[PDB]
Amino acid sequence: ESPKEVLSRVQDAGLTLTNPNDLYWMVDFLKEKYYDNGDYYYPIKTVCDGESIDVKFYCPFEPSLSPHYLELYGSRDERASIYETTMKKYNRINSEKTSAICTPYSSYGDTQIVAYFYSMMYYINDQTAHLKLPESEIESELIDILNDDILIYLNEFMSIFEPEDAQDLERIWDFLDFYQPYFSKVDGKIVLDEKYLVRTPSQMPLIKTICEYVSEQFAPSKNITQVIWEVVRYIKGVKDEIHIRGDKSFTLSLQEYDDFRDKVTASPMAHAVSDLTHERFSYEAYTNPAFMELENRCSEIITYFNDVCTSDRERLDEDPFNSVFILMDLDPSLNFAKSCDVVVEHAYNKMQAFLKLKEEILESASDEEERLALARMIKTREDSLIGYVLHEVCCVEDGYARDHKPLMKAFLEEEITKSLAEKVKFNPV
């Protein structure tokens, strides 16, 4: 469409997330207003316990939205039929928007597979969130189901894992840790014992859809060990979260929170699959200690940004595992607004640490092939960082985001109206 008809729609109906075209104009506005002006501080306007949360998320990477977002959104009802879900829950997760904005330069299928991975994290997260309830409301049967589900989910990823190198089979086998006694190595594959296939988990169609795509698209020609490795790390992290949330003794320091969030942010799973979509790819990077730290900085930045945006909702859940609340518990002078400022500052320092690791990783490359591979893999993680910022910025319609921001809806509608008018006025120049 033209800026004139979009301006007419915004002046009359405002901005929506139900019309997928609006997101293209929102992301275009954010790039022109911020990135294109050298301003890498994106506004986040929300509330927490009645306190105004008015902060800036720092991210110096180029904003973009996938050209496939229109088709992804147009097929969202078919996609949702895979899930055991209400549409109310599916709409708030909005994996179509997450994948399109964090993975903007991929094919339709390579963008959709990222949506599937992020949706898997959200649905498992909301299943684990049952442990947030008071002790008198916990149902042990739901916890038994959850513990069985993630073990069965893990085996489904094991079932597509047939590495060319036996060293990669040992890498995953040694990484199973407390899950290893449930598995056996059988004909070059890691298999769950038949005793523990006791149910069909509620999101098994989703997990099978993920495994089928990875098996059919990447397993024949690429080394998918890191995809499996990150899934193991995530599933073990969910188990750690169950153990952490199960014991109502919440004793996580900020560093222990970082180490825990390194496992459960799920973006490393999406990066592992996205890495396989590019010819520039170095499997050795995954065991490079500097690259592993770069992935951890990325997960922590997303976590800290998420902690600010989820603060008011998680405060009502009495959920203590949020960097905003951990800092307040350690410092009594902090209210919610001042704590969010500290989290935002920590996120800025992690971003600078990310950029410092990036320069060191690329300088350590031994040849052009490895440099271009590392640079491509780092670029993929940068896409997710700016994508997640814009994801939270553009929560402008209630029901189509985990954390609707009515102050962002008002701010973006006021600002995009002036920007679209400037496009119309100088047209066709």
Ligand SMILES: CC(C)=CCC/C(C)=C/CN[C@@H](CCC(=O)O)C(=O)O
């Ligand atoms: C690009 C994406 C999608 C990154 C993952 C975002 C993230 C860090 C999710 C963690 N989930 C939160 C609560 C989110 C919610 O409930 O909406 C938690 O459990 O700490």
Ligand SMILES: [Mg+2]
């Ligand atoms: Mg949280």
